[PDB]
Design a protein around this ligand. Structure first.
Ligand SMILES: [Mg+2]
Ligand SMILES: [Mg+2]
Ligand SMILES: [Mg+2]
Ligand SMILES: [Mg+2]
Ligand SMILES: [Mg+2]
Ligand SMILES: [Mg+2]
Lengths: 83, 83, 81, 79, 82, 79
DNA sequence: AACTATGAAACAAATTTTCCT
DNA sequence: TTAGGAAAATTTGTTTCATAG
DNA sequence: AACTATGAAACAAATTTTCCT
DNA sequence: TTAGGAAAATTTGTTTCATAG
């Protein structure tokens, strides 16, 4: 098994960008990771922690609260900075 | 953390070829893996199983019993076949 | 062509492979339970497994004759295991 | 009991010229797996029937309970 | 060159940060124990950590002037952490 | 209480011009870590001494046990 | 080809915040 | 009104990776 | 650029074998 | 001499990866 050659930030952005409304709940993001790569079908304690850490740490990922909870979105302009 | 871009057989051969007498016990091979790459400092249940599996499966790795137990060696001619 | 297996050949196998060369009905049932469970696989599964075994085990050698390709068994390399 | 290796050997071993193409091995496995699928729900009664029908299977009653044995001479007479 | 810390400023910090602005001697000791344990780090450790924090937190802005580059604190940006 | 951020901020805030080069921050941390290393075995007695020496620290005896408080007015004079 | 130095990423954790029994 | 638990977030400090010199 | 087919590798496990309490 | 335990080996069958076509 090989981990994808992309950063967590890039992968998370990919997940969100591929969604129909450009937004995903945390659990939906986890699902995208496990469905897409074999690497994420094990050691969940490690990679899910990485995902949450990246979502909070990086300003390009903005939590948008809504009636049923909250979804994560991507501030593309922000994502582009430093990259 | 990234796993080395080499097969288990290639890494095992490397460990043995670097030893002073071209022989290593199983525990010494585990130690070479952990000392050499961060990747092998976690999920021991998985990679140690991989190492034992590779040692038995591939004919290029020959167990040589000795007074103190047994060491693993490499049949270079064999390793070269299929490669 | 003779069937690969029959209840008779299977019952004989169960008994012959046993310790005392004897089995109670319940023991024969246990053996059959395990055996039928093993075969409850699909073509996609066994087909993959067959190719895997032919290219992994040395006892299986492919002899190319005036037909295309045929696999044979090296009994001497088969016994060692 | 069975492994793909023993099965592949059985197929090849039980064929004249002791050879088989990959397609022929596939055919043998198809027949074999079909057999077990077809009889997955009948083997219990089939076994009881065979035990009492064929003389090669002899019931030996010992201390506690009874056991079944094979009369190899009788068995080898069927073929 | 007044010291960055003195027992006096530390004792006051422990008491001021407390719930009811008052601590027993033992509570002050517990605070000091934790504090001294935090600082038991080597130069290789804190040096790395300092560079890490300067380039991670936006409240720390490098204002490049005349010669060399000096940092500074964005009191407002630091407000979030407050 | 303390994080590298609060410390870096403390250093810069206590400096003139409220600015510091990376080397100056390094100097401040060197002095700071040196302080805690130097006094790792003396702080218990040092704390007891300071509490009874400085009037800004007042011992208030309530129901069970006694607690220490800071007389903010007194503390500020000396600064 | 080695080796060092170093920021971005990755990691491992300790805490916090919310929503529910 | 608290007490806990699980998710979800937020934070901190350390280790690893990729590479410019 | 996509997609399929497929052998090598990688995985996950069930068992075995040895050496010691 | 039987009963585990753990490390070391051996085995089997399934999933993943890289890539020819
Ligand atoms: Mg964010
Ligand atoms: Mg071997
Ligand atoms: Mg082979
Ligand atoms: Mg009969
Ligand atoms: Mg920053
Ligand atoms: Mg006093």
């Amino acid at each position: 098994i090989v981990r994808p050659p992309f950063t967590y930030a890039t992968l998370i952005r990919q997940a969100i960008m591929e969604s129909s409304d450009r937004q995903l709940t945390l659990n939906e993001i986890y699902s995208w990771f496990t469905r897409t790569f074999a690497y994420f079908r094990r050691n969940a304690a490690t990679w899910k922690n990485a995902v949450r850490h990246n979502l909070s740490l990086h300003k390009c990922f903005v939590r948008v609260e809504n009636v049923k909870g909250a979804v994560w979105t991507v501030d593309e302009v922000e994502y582009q900075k430093r990259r």
